[PDB]
Design a protein around this nucleic acid. Structure first.
Lengths: 171, 52, 195, 49, 174, 198, 175, 52, 207
RNA sequence: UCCUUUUGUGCGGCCUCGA
């Protein structure tokens, strides 16, 4: 789910960049280091609002190293899944152990043990799919799944979904 | 045809350089060289190229 | 696209199957004046990486598959002492090789191969069936299975008191004696080979 | 071994009178035995004991 | 990498059950609590965003940045390529595709009407912003379906859920 | 204790350990205490009473272990030291004509990045050998003709124009470590002809 | 190995008509795959008439062995090789042996035997759906492109045709 | 799995297989499995041991 | 079964070196570690320990006349192009000439048939890649002088408009960091720009 | 073909040196 958050970043600048374009260079460095990153505490940062008018303040010279340290505060749009939440998805790959879907940048893996039995995986189908009498879910098909567990990595997030409950599956 | 990822990352070192700018290759002759078409498909799965 | 993918996968499957069939279809080495399929008596040699420090380790396997008389040579292989030790070893009454196999980790193995071949040719070390006499053959051995055998826990349990290079020599000799069973002993590791 | 030189020692491990010595040079050569490592994997004359 | 405006949180001895993340129980943790603080330390409420609001905001910010970087002189691919970083480009492309293929409201005025309906309503004055975002995002059609998908709405039975859902479907472009 | 009555939930009761059984909920990070799957972590999927099934984190496959062998550990933090025969970032010979670099290490498997970029998952036994190349062999030459040793930072000019520090050298290929490429922990393979030294 | 192959098959025992259709389908598939070999056979052995009929009979016999008698490929290759080759005497009384099939072709016949059951299940499901539709008069297009259908893609096309043109009956049975 | 069962059955009966027919008469294998495997497993025959 | 396979020259070479006879052949270019430097021959060792050799006619350029010892040193590593491979003795011959080491880039027999290869798109992409390799970095110049002002030509004229005749302003020149344009007021609404060429510059920003 | 090298104890006691 998307949210608005007030975030802060610590930026260290080498003395070779102490020029008139210091503010703009700090802005582009902040944009390159924030746009598209994935932090487990917050989720996924997609964009930073008012990216060209962010206040950077006055940098503090680190004693013994010369480099300046800047405290940059900004507001950004952040997306993070939650345990027990139902969201839409698009299937990206089909495998005997289960299917892999994509929810924006996040990839969600659903095992067969969380899939209803009537949706039997058909590897002979072109393309391979988990199909039932009235349902057929393959690559690129819209699916509604419920996030059960979230796994946090250093700079990555792994989510596990399920479709065994009602109002789930093919949509 | 090449995507931007394919436009950049398709270097001479890469195995996909053989078919970077291929055209007019008939389907009947693909079965003679399965490795070529499999490499094309694997390159497509990486998001580098598109088989049309 | 799916149809061509399936067809090409079938063709590649059959090509890989034929390549693996060419790999594993090998009989044991036939000693001269003996019927094909008879298990030979093998002696294998290898110093390892070929460095200054590395010594040559030998393993003798008879036709019954039993390892006999592993030995360690304590002299430079380019000297006369190593040649004398190898001549005494081969001409010993309790050891009667049918073939001598050599393999190693780098190009230094060529010097060992040339040294052993020259020694065998000059001294006229013939096969001892204990008439027509034939010199023992010196060949290079493909060590596809030996390098995985030397690290396998089954080999370590089989020979607890032996170093890795001794297990490499045993793997080479076993490969000479029966390539098929040596490929089978890899179990899951044979899918990682260069087929 | 140490970083100093060993060429000033004799066969018996002792330096002889009349020889010039600088700092750190070895004047008495002594060794103690050590149970050998797995170097019996094959080291013809270069396994440390 | 980035640090939140909320700090401290030192060691104690008591342990609480309102610490694990759970959408059903409406326990969003300290960093996503209902009460937040801005850079000035003033009171601030948690800002949820539906896919329509999020899509409008990301499109507005991206086109503003593209216009600014071009000296003040619509395509999703070029707009994504405006940003820097190959992994960042892939992430923004994936978000743009996800938002485009599930955009319930592609118009600014429809999104404004939806936000006004979901905010100024008397029943929605008690509704959590996460519930509002989920209702405006998932596009549910039935009260029972909404309760099953959103367990939090089960305990709030003083909400005219059915007519709000029908108004949302009406505002939704077929 | 937890119950529908609030007054009961505010009481602490001391209970002997002989009459306690752990409760494992679906979707919790748990680390295996003891068994063949020791130190495996993952998320619980199915709770069949005494037997608990969970999708692993390392092997990323479902594993069935008894509930007596599980501890709720929210993070893995598994150390791979004193295992296998391969340190992290080792240049390992996969087979006769294949080589790669260890990217991630596991208790009974490894992740290897090939010289051409393909990733492989193999058991330790299936790896042919480890290449202990000499320092003189571990030297390459950039496009300008300037020598580049291990630890020298270089930056490309063709392609995506990435930058990294040299981690290993194999033939004409340079294995580079970089800060911004988080996809393979900074390890990306380029030929020495594509880079310029800084 | 046969149990491992057939573990995924819901029902392996086909009826007589379905079994004959399976044999014909495998013969047609082998004819498609082995076109160059059949062309070489026809060109280089022009003096012998109806060799392709002998090829069809041999393929049907191999399918019969594999399905009914459950013989694996090495047993067929060793002890049933006379059904996999044809012999004749030329005008000069020359004994000539022609090898119609090899071991790889036997493995391919095993693979086609395994493959056809998915087609059979799909065709059975499509026919069942058509039965539940219960048309007053049989649709000539449906039967015309159902009798000649030999791949699951065409069965999927017929399924799409049926769910489109008779969507009202599908809705009644049940977008 | 059948191989291990066969090995265990032989080790039960006495770790020696006298004749091919004993794979059926001793109920060691079923009819079709024996029909497949009969000619691919062999028993070494020593004429000095069997004078009859 | 077939007889026991006995390795040939190519199989022995692949076994002992792990380099196939395809990836190590005539015309390829590899980095080699120099080991001996003499007046007429040079001995090098490749990465896979294959002993190389280079002759006097292949060490030095035709226009060069210096002795080979002065040009290269032991322990240095250089690029060389393979001229012959002896697969039995594990010996090879190399050449360090520019004509062999650099020009031979297209080492693969890619089928560039016009009917089967998109020649024009490849040419356009390669031209764009050269046009991107032509990109350069540049920045402004800072000079410390009382009469120096970082202004344009028109800006300097407007600045001198408010000042009487004879006042002097100094601005950076458009011809490069090595040039300085000095503008002085000749007359009301009449100014002269004079370009000054700098020699023996200590730095781009320096005078 | 040959060349190829690396590090240090602890704890007390006594006698001294400059303030």
């Amino acid at each position: 789910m998307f949210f608005l958050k007030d975030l802060s970043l610590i930026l260290t600048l080498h003395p070779s960049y102490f020029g008139p374009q210091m503010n703009q260079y700090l802005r582009e460095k902040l944009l390159t280091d924030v746009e598209g990153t994935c932090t487990g505490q917050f989720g996924y940062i997609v964009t930073v609002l008012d990216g060209m008018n962010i206040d950077v303040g006055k940098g503090r010279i680190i004693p013994g190293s010369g480099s300046a340290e800047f405290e940059v505060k900004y507001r950004a749009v952040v997306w993070k899944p939650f345990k027990g939440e139902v969201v839409d998805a698009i299937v990206s790959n089909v495998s005997p152990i289960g299917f892999f879907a994509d929810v924006g940048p996040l990839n969600v893996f659903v095992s067969t043990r969380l899939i209803p039995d009537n949706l039997v995986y058909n590897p002979s189908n072109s393309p391979p799919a988990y199909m039932s009498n009235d349902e057929l879910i393959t690559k690129g098909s819209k699916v509604r799944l419920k996030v059960v567990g979230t796994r946090t990595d250093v700079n990555e997030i792994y989510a596990i979904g399920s479709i065994k409950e009602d109002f789930l599956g093919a949509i | 045809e090449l995507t931007e990822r394919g436009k950049l990352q398709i270097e001479p070192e890469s195995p996909y350089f053989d078919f970077k700018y291929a055209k007019n290759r008939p389907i009947s002759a693909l079965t003679a060289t399965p490795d070529l078409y499999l490499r094309m498909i694997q390159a497509e799965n990486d998001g580098l190229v598109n088989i049309k | 696209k799916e149809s061509i993918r399936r067809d090409c996968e079938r063709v590649l499957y059959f090509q890989v199957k034929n390549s693996f069939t060419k790999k594993i279809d090998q009989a044991p080495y036939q000693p001269p004046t003996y019927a094909k399929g008879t298990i030979p008596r093998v002696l294998t040699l290898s110093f390892g990486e070929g460095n200054r420090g590395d010594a040559v380790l030998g393993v003798f396997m008879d036709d019954s598959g039993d390892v006999k008389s592993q030995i360690k040579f304590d002299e430079d292989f380019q000297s006369r002492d190593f040649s004398d030790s190898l001549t005494r070893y081969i001409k010993s009454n309790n050891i009667n090789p049918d073939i001598i196999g050599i393999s190693g980790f780098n190009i230094h193995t060529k010097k060992l191969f040339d040294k052993v071949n020259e020694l065998v040719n000059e001294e006229r070390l013939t096969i001892e069936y204990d008439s027509d006499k034939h010199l023992i053959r010196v060949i290079y051995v493909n060590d596809e299975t030996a390098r995985l055998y030397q690290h396998s826990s089954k080999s370590s349990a089989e020979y607890p008191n032996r170093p890795q290079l001794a297990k490499y020599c045993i793997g080479l000799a076993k490969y000479i004696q029966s390539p098929l069973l040596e490929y089978l002993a890899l179990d899951e590791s044979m899918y990682s080979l260069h087929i | 071994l140490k970083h100093g030189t060993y060429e000033k020692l004799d066969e018996d491990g002792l330096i002889a009178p009349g020889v010039r010595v600088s700092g750190d040079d070895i004047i008495i050569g002594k060794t103690t035995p050590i149970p050998p490592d797995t170097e019996e994997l094959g080291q013809r004359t270069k396994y440390h004991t | 990498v980035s640090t939140s405006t909320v700090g401290a949180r030192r060691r104690r001895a008591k342990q609480q059950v309102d610490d694990e993340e759970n959408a059903t129980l409406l326990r969003l943790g300290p960093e996503f609590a209902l009460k937040q603080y801005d850079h000035d330390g003033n009171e601030h409420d948690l800002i949820a965003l539906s896919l329509s609001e999020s899509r409008l905001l990301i499109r507005e910010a991206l086109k503003a940045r593209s216009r600014a970087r071009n000296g003040g002189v619509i395509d999703d691919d070029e707009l994504a390529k405006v940003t820097s970083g190959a992994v960042a480009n892939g992430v923004v492309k994936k978000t743009l595709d996800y938002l485009n293929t599930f955009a319930r409201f592609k118009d600014e005025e429809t999104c404004t009407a939806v936000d006004q309906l979901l905010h100024n309503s008397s029943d929605c004055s008690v509704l959590h912003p996460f519930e509002i975002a989920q209702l405006s995002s998932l596009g549910c059609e039935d009260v029972d379906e909404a309760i099953t998908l959103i367990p939090s709405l089960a305990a709030k039975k003083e909400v005219n859920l059915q007519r709000i859902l029908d108004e949302l479907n009406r505002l939704e472009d077929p | 204790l937890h119950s529908d009555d609030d007054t009961i939930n505010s009481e602490t009761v001391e209970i002997p350990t002989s009459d306690l059984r752990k409760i494992f909920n679906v979707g919790d990070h748990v680390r295996v205490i003891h068994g063949k799957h020791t130190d495996d972590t993952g998320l619980i999927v199915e709770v069949n009473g005494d037997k608990v099934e969970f999708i692993s984190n390392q092997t990323k496959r479902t594993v069935i272990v008894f509930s007596n062998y599980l501890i709720k550990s929210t993070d893995s933090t598994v150390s791979i030291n004193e295992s296998g025969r391969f340190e992290l970032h080792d240049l390992v010979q996969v087979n006769s004509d294949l080589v790669g670099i260890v990217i991630r290490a596991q208790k009974d498997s490894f992740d290897v990045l090939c010289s051409d970029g393909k990733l492989l998952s193999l058991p330790p036994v299936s790896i042919y050998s480890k290449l202990n190349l000499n320092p003189n062999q571990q030297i390459a030459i950039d496009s300008n003709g300037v020598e580049v040793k291990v630890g020298d930072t270089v930056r490309e000019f063709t392609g995506e124009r990435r930058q990294g520090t040299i981690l290993h050298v194999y033939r004409n290929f340079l294995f580079l470590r970089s800060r911004e490429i988080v996809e393979n922990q900074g390890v990306f393979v380029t030929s020495s002809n594509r880079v310029k030294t800084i | 190995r046969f149990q491992a192959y057939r573990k995924s098959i819901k029902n392996y025992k086909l009826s007589d008509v379905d079994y004959s259709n399976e044999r014909d389908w495998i013969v047609e598939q082998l004819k498609l795959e082995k076109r160059d070999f059949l062309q070489h056979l026809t060109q280089a052995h022009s003096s012998v008439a109806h060799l392709e009929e002998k090829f069809e009979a041999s393929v049907k016999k191999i399918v019969d062995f594999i399905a009914i008698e459950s013989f694996e490929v090495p047993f067929i290759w060793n002890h049933r090789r006379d059904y996999a080759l044809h012999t004749y005497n030329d005008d000069s009384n020359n004994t000539i042996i022609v090898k119609l099939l090899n071991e790889d072709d036997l493995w391919r016949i095993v693979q086609l035997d395994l493959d056809y059951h998915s087609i059979h299940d799909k065709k059975a499901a499509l026919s069942s759906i058509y039965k539940q539709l219960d048309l007053d008069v049989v649709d000539p297009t449906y039967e015309e492109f159902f009798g000649s259908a030999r791949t699951l893609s065409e069965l999927q096309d017929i399924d799409d045709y049926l769910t489109f043109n008779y969507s009202s009956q599908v809705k009644n049975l049940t977008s | 799995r059948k191989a291990a069962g066969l090995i265990q059955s032989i080790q039960r009966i006495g770790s020696n297989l006298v004749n091919r027919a004993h794979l059926i008469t001793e109920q060691l294998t079923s009819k079709t499995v024996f029909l497949n495997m009969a000619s691919f497993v062999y028993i070494v025959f020593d004429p000095d041991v069997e004078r009859n | 079964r077939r007889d026991f396979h006995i390795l040939n020259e190519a199989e022995i070479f692949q076994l002992l070196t792990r380099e196939t006879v395809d990836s190590f052949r005539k015309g390829m270019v590899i980095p080699v570690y120099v080991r001996k430097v003499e007046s007429s021959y040079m001995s090098v060792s490749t990465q896979s320990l294959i002993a190389g050799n280079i002759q006097r006619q292949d060490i030095l350029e035709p226009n060069d006349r210096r002795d080979p010892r002065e040009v290269y040193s032991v322990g240095q590593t250089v690029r060389a192009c393979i001229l012959d491979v002896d697969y039995y003795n594990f010996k090879c011959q190399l050449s360090l000439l520019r004509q062999f080491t650099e020009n031979q880039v297209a080492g693969l027999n890619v089928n560039r048939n016009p009917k089967f290869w998109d020649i024009e798109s490849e040419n356009r992409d390669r031209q764009e890649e050269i046009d991107k390799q032509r990109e350069e970095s540049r920045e402004s110049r800072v000079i410390k002088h009382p009469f120096f002002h970082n202004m344009k030509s028109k800006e300097a004229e407007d600045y001198l408009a408010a000042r009487p005749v004879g006042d002097v302003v100094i601005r950076p020149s458009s011809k490069g960091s090595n040039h300085i344009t000095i503008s002085w007021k000749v007359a009301p609404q009449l100014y002269q720009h004079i370009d000054v060429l700098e020699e023996n510059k200590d730095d781009a920003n320096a005078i």
